[PDB]
Design a protein around this ligand. Structure first.
Ligand code: O4P
Ligand code: O3V
Ligand code: O3V
Ligand code: MG
Ligand code: MG
Lengths: 337, 335, 339
């Protein structure tokens, strides 16, 4: 939906320098922007390049203004303003509009105002959908689960039974919330299933990427705090608790009963042991092997990175035989002393 | 709801308390209220049992003196907990009866008391045994057979010519029987090898969510009886998993791997193919399995987490460990 | 499906030795093959074993021929011939046939000739499906997405909006193409979602496995080249670019804005970080931890393999304390240097 540059600047709390009557149709990268587009500059090295940008307007700082070759929106934080103006001008469609005739909705489900449910979605008994909730095509929402106002599920999302999801969440396709945790007792080598009768509680403003799995708790609950962001294909095991505003990048695997504090950042492909705690304000870099609890804030890392194969072969053999190397060092220390 | 005396009988536990107590469900020790039964395994909880508000606590004999409520004595409280949770299970069924929106090929063979959920799709030639439950939105491909008592949750995908035994359970998002990753090369161009093998899943198999089990190239991918597989796992074509083996979340297996019985593969492990792991092998989390394993026991790999400042130095020295080795050899020669 | 051996041999450009009138009904492994099956031998150690194989015909080399105990098709490359003959005798069914009445298709969708759409699939407005496209049951294809002629989706595949897929592609079930990239800004300690309005562009002859995810770009596009093959459980982040004919094995994770060249081979469970480039003809072995750009072709590797747990505990402790070992070595060198 087009907008006048002056009106866009007002909504962004930005200082307009140029023609307020310019009509902005959408956001584009600096290299792709054309007439009608607004873009942004975060790297002052592109000041000399602005004359090569064909956008109708550019978001920049006060220091950048003398280098402009277009209408400019001056702000303190061009990146944040970019996020805000991309939401104003978002072209992303909704997962559904209205309630599709092919959706199958139990008579006991409770629908709020302005709820949309896509084709062939399945809503179980007792489900409660808040105002403005959107359920994509082909989703399944299990018995008695509740989804808060403004939350949206893309196509082919699976929500099991007794799940609680807060307001203004966003869940991408393929995600499964509330499957059985990996709970079994061993009986003379045979695995005896332990029913998982806990739930999943997801807070407000949670975003979950595609094909992520969040299992329900065994007795008490798996809990996702407010404002948490989770990338694609993470495994959040039963009775994991993730604190508010924590970010979990793609492909992270967590074991059961792990507690992650608030304000943490878990890098992609990390692996985290269970029945332990990570305190607030912890950053684990990508592929971290998290075996022990983390009790102090800060940045933690693991992994021996890539080498040419010929070189790696020796690195690996030497590390595997490092005990012998250690004994040789000690022996030579004694001989010299 | 069940009387404590009757529950203790079905669990073969010795009752120490009022058997007329009504038990309505299971709860954790910290959450239990009147009417709940709970359990304890770690002796550290003996001391605040007076604070637990459960109507009954499953415990061992040595725990009995510390009991502050009715108690059921057993040898293995965790196994008894498993059993009593099944008796008191509240989990609903994926479906009940056959939904009008389900699309079922007329040549499908359905046993007695088969339930198929809304908008599930059943292909031609499919055979569903007695008491099988198919969740909403599932797909079951041509000529696949699912044994009596087995259950699929919503949005499970079974390809064609798949065989699943009795009393299995498959969680949502899982895909059984996709093409294995098989290709020939014709001057840099990948040439697809059709994957016309199958997947054979035994009895009492439980598979997690968003797990993938590829069909074999010519012969079959085989999952033994009693196997349990967690979420986000990849089981490549022609993998064979022995009975009662457990695979934790996020495990990736390459093609033609053979795993024995009673194994335990820790989460996020990576197991390479065309090799065998013997019975009774445990691989700890993130294990990097490159070589065959021929002796039972516990195996591990990986350098664990350190503070970033410390890790920088560790990784740099490790990557230059060959120079360290050469310097040590030189020093030995000089001395 | 069934074919005379002589005709099969002709289509494979193979030299027939034996009865061309034999009727071949399918392909089977050497151990499983029975009458009517054709099989193949790539390992000459099985020459002594051919008398135990009950296939009606065996594909082999000229050097193998004296060891045959059946009709033989002689070729230069038995493995490639096996791929070709398995395609000829393929028993894999199609994901769908015709347009299912339970499918929900927007009136503005444009369908080519001989399109098939499986039961309960959902096709959004503006979608374009090329000739001979097959959409499996339960799929979702989002607004304005385009799927090229001959391309096929198995059941329960999710294609978001504004996605472009080329010709003769194949996508296995549970895969998600075009979900939001992992993009967020920071407003005084609060995550602010960055709309991901780029796309995914997939070329021709691309094969993608099951439960793989390929996110759309933030502004510009995530791009998959022609002839690329991608295994199960892979994660391709926003704005990744993959060059033609590259192969990505199962469970690989690629972070945002990674560019991978042509003819690369990425081993299973590798982790490739973003905002960097990997040149043509690079092989990364399994579980490789890629933190830096790769500018020369060749084979690269990382990882310390498995050991018995008691041994690993000692290895891990010594490695974690390697800075102390380095300092002791340097001290000893000074002593040996008489300083
Ligand atoms: C050197 O060991 C480690 C290295 C890193 C993490 C943990 C490590 O030790 C603990 C461990 O291995 N587990 C708890 C595994 C097993 C459970 C039973 C047998 S193995 C596991 C299961 N589900 C999981 C999900 C994620 C991660 C691990 C698991
Ligand atoms: C949420 C945010 C705006 C900022 C952020 O913190 C972050 C983001 N995207 C990431 N992708 N990957 C990744 C993905 C796959 C493989 C390897 C790495 C990370 O590790 C990512 C991280 C983090 C870095 C360190 C801790 S979290 C985007
Ligand atoms: C595409 C191809 C026809 C040939 C190929 O190169 C390849 C294939 N399948 C693989 N599976 N795994 C794997 C999967 C899971 C865990 C561990 C390993 C690899 O690493 C694989 C590789 C590669 C090896 C080295 C680089 S890519 C089949
Ligand atoms: Mg329908
Ligand atoms: Mg992984």
């Amino acid at each position: 939906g087009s907008i006048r540059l002056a009106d866009l600047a007002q909504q962004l709390d930005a200082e307009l320098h140029g023609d307020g009557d310019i009509v902005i149709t959408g956001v584009a990268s600096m290299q792709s922007a054309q007439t009608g587009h607004i873009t942004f500059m975060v790297n002052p090295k592109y000041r000399e390049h602005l004359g090569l940008c064909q956008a109708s307007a550019v978001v920049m700082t006060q220091d950048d203004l003398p280098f402009a070759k277009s209408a400019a929106l001056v702000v303190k934080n061009p990146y944040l303003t970019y996020a805000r103006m991309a939401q104003i001008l978002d072209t992303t469609p909704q997962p559904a509009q209205n309630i599709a005739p092919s959706a199958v909705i139990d008579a006991t489900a409770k629908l709020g105002n302005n709820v949309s449910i896509g084709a062939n979605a399945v809503i179980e008994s007792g489900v409660e959908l808040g105002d403005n909730v959107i359920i994509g095509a082909g989703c399944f929402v299990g018995k008695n689960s509740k989804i808060g106002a403004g939350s949206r599920l893309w196509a082919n999302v699976t929500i099991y039974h007794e799940i609680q999801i807060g307001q203004n969440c966003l869940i991408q396709s393929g995600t499964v919330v509330g499957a059985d945790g990996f709970g079994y007792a061993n009986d003379r080598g045979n695995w005896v299933k332990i029913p998982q009768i806990g739930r999943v509680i997801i807070g407000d403003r949670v975003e979950i990427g595609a094909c992520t799995t969040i299992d329900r708790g065994a007795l008490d609950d798996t809990i996702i705090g407010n404002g948490v962001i989770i990338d694609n294909q993470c495994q959040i095991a039963h009775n994991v608790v993730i604190g508010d505003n924590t970010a979990v990048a793609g492909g992270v695997i967590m074991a059961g009963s792990l507690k992650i504090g608030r304000y943490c950042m878990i890098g992609g492909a990390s692996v985290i042991n269970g029945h332990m705690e990570i305190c607030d304000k912890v950053t684990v870099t990508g592929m971290g092997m998290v075996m022990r609890p983390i009790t102090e804030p800060g940045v933690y890392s693991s992994g021996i990175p890539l080498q040419p194969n010929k070189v790696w072969r020796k690195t690996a053999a030497l590390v595997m035989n490092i005990d012998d190397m250690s004994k040789r060092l000690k022996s030579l220390e004694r001989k010299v002393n």
